[PDB]
């Protein structure tokens, strides 16, 4: 089976800006595309399970752990919980001018442990192939690089894919994550047609992803910069303690305070 996880970046500031811009694309449609995308995954097979996770400047909350419309009864329950939960999160929220950038590493951290928690629960007979369908919708935060970098390695160790589907901005850090763990990357420019990308590129599972033609991987610039400047450096200097990329030769690196001896 597969355990899909949609880490939606429901940033009120960015999505609210779209509302102010009165653009055709809106968060409500995005959740519907996620909703339809989520419904399709379970619709593939009974054994499949999914989960939905949002993101906010304050905190991230899980959007997911008769047939009045005629659809499958199980999918009806998923729609109700997701529709109500997202509205509660969006409508209710505090204000903090200092912190306005969306957080994604924290939301992913909640995702990675969920598979492990679910991986323990699943019986030994059935093997699970979990995946995380991160849908980024805003620029990354500078201060979250280290935190985001740790979660990615955990996914690689536990073999969970991060199929980033960023939109409106190419996240240099996020595109780094999908490459390390083998996840897919896609920068959809047609936001109104976002869902059709999901059903094609992201919907198929890993066991079937190989036997399918998908957009080629985008070049990932593994830039390194000196801690002085934050400017790209090709030849970097580090010490055996800080493990810190540095500008040039120094008698002692500040972050270390070590009594480095010349030679």
């Amino acid at each position: 089976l597969n355990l899909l996880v949609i880490v939606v970046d429901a940033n009120p500031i960015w999505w609210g800006k779209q509302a102010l811009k009165e653009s055709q694309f809106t968060l409500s449609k995005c959740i519907d595309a996620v909703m339809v995308l989520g419904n399709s995954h379970l619709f593939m097979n009974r054994s499949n399970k999914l989960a939905v996770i949002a993101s906010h400047i304050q905190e991230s909350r899980f959007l997911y752990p008769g047939s009045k419309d005629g659809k499958y009864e199980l999918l009806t329950s998923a729609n109700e919980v997701i529709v109500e939960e997202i509205k509660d999160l969006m409508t209710k929220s505090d204000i903090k001018g200092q912190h306005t950038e969306t957080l994604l590493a924290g939301s992913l951290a909640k995702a990675l442990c969920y598979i492990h928690r679910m991986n323990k629960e699943v019986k030994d007979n059935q093997e699970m192939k979990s995946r995380i369908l991160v849908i980024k919708a805003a620029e990354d935060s500078a201060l979250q690089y280290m935190n985001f970098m740790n979660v990615i390695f955990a996914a690689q160790k536990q073999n969970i894919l991060i199929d980033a589907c960023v939109l409106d901005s190419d996240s240099g850090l996020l595109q780094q994550a999908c490459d390390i763990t083998g996840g897919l990357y896609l920068k959809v420019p047609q936001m109104p047609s976002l869902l059709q990308y999901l059903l094609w590129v992201f919907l198929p599972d890993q066991d079937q992803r190989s036997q399918l033609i998908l957009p080629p991987p985008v070049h990932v610039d593994y830039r390194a910069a000196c801690f002085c400047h934050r400017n790209l450096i090709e030849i970097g200097y580090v010490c055996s303690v800080c493990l810190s990329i540095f500008c040039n030769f120094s008698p002692i690196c500040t972050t270390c305070e070590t009594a480095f001896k010349i030679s």
């Binding site: 005629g70 659809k71 009864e73 999918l75 190989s210 033609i213």
Partner: protein, 390 residues
């Protein structure tokens, strides 16, 4: 299989079957691995796409999967080339499904199914029902020839007994569905219910038959609501096989003892064990009755005691091999009707007749050295006419 049954259907019935959304989901689920993704692709599309695009969406590796899935769904007629848009009813109906628009039960199913099997064999204590009796007889696995006397078991009926309960039930359902149209019961209604069950007058009669088989159980004096059993949606062994043709069946049910007695001699009876010996006389009788050896090995194989599971092969090879030899022993002489031609004075023309017989597909055996061949009597006239024509 379920998908096999759907393929052998007309387009008219198929579209009718594509009614309420649950049916489309049921038919969708059996799309093996690839065609499922294709279905989601061309679900929101109202414009047909070229067939070439579909072919090039699967890498050269595992290409065979691309064709087989396409062939399967073409048989299902989900889309049409239209020159590959899905069926408008299927697309709409599927969209409705896709966000649009207990312990007692298993025992009851096992017991109710068992009594039917009891009736299958000459068990005096079995459920009696005129509709059920004619159903099995018309199912091709039983024959009465005298309504007053209880019916016997046909050659295929004995084989049906040894089949595993899942396959045993599915085959009966497959036969029932085919006979439903003949008796006047619409196939779509019963077939659609089965898909809906996995999650009218015709249904009421159909539901009663399902209740008889134990798949469904109302529990409330035949109320509108029903509680399907485990078997309706779609076990440790007890037999110890010895190298000396001895079976110790840890059976309390009389049906299992009856099954094992088909191809073995029962020696002693104990509550949790029955001693049976697989003598060639019993096996030859079982093969003569209609049984096939592979079933006998499979039937013993599936009902294997846990102690034998660790051993590999679980069934000792000699017992398995000996059973096969007993079966092959009976069929040493392969009788085959045919017409022999001799005195082939025209040696040159004999080859020409040989070629003509081969072309028609009537020739069975030939001997060039002796200039003779055997042809089935069905094609005897054709070759006789050819010889007369000269």
């Amino acid at each position: 299989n379920l998908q096999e049954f759907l393929g052998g259907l007309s387009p008219g019935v198929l579209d009718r079957l594509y009614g309420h959304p649950a049916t489309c989901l049921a038919v969708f689920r059996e799309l093996p691995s690839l065609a499922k993704n294709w279905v989601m692709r061309m679900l929101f599309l109202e414009q047909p796409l070229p067939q070439a695009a579909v072919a090039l969406w699967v890498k050269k590796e595992f290409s065979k999967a691309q064709e087989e899935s396409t062939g399967l769904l073409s048989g299902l007629r989900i889309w049409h080339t239209q020159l590959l848009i899905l069926n408008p009813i299927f697309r709409q109906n599927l969209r409705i499904a896709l966000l649009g628009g207990v312990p007692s039960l298993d025992k009851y199913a096992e017991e109710r199914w068992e009594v039917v099997l009891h009736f299958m064999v000459g068990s005096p204590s079995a459920a009696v029902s005129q509709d059920l009796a004619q159903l099995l007889s018309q199912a091709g696995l039983m024959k009465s020839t005298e309504p007053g006397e209880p019916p016997c078991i046909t050659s295929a009926g004995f084989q049906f007994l040894l089949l595993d309960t899942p396959a045993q039930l599915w085959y009966f359902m497959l036969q029932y569905l085919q006979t439903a149209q003949s008796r006047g019961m619409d196939l779509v209604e019963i077939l659609s219910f089965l898909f809906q069950l996995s999650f009218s007058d015709s249904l009421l009669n159909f539901l009663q038959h399902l209740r008889e088989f134990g798949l469904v159980f109302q529990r409330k004096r035949k109320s509108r609501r029903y509680y399907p059993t485990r078997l309706a949606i779609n076990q440790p062994g007890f037999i110890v096989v010895e190298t000396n043709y001895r079976l110790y069946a840890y059976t309390e049910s009389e049906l299992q003892i009856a099954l094992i007695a088909l191809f073995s001699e029962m020696l002693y009876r104990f509550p949790n064990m029955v001693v049976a010996q697989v003598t060639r006389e019993s096996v030859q009788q079982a093969i003569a009755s209609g049984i096939t050896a592979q079933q006998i090995i499979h039937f013993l194989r599936t009902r294997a005691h846990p102690v034998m599971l660790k051993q590999t092969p679980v069934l000792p090879p000699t017992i398995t091999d000996q059973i096969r030899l007993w079966e092959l022993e009976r069929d040493r002489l392969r009788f085959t009707e045919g017409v022999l031609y001799n005195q082939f004075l025209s040696q040159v023309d004999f080859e020409l007749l040989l070629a003509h017989a081969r072309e028609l597909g009537v020739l069975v055996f030939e001997n060039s050295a002796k200039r003779l061949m055997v042809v089935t009597p069905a094609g005897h006239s054709d070759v006789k006419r050819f010889w007369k024509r000269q």
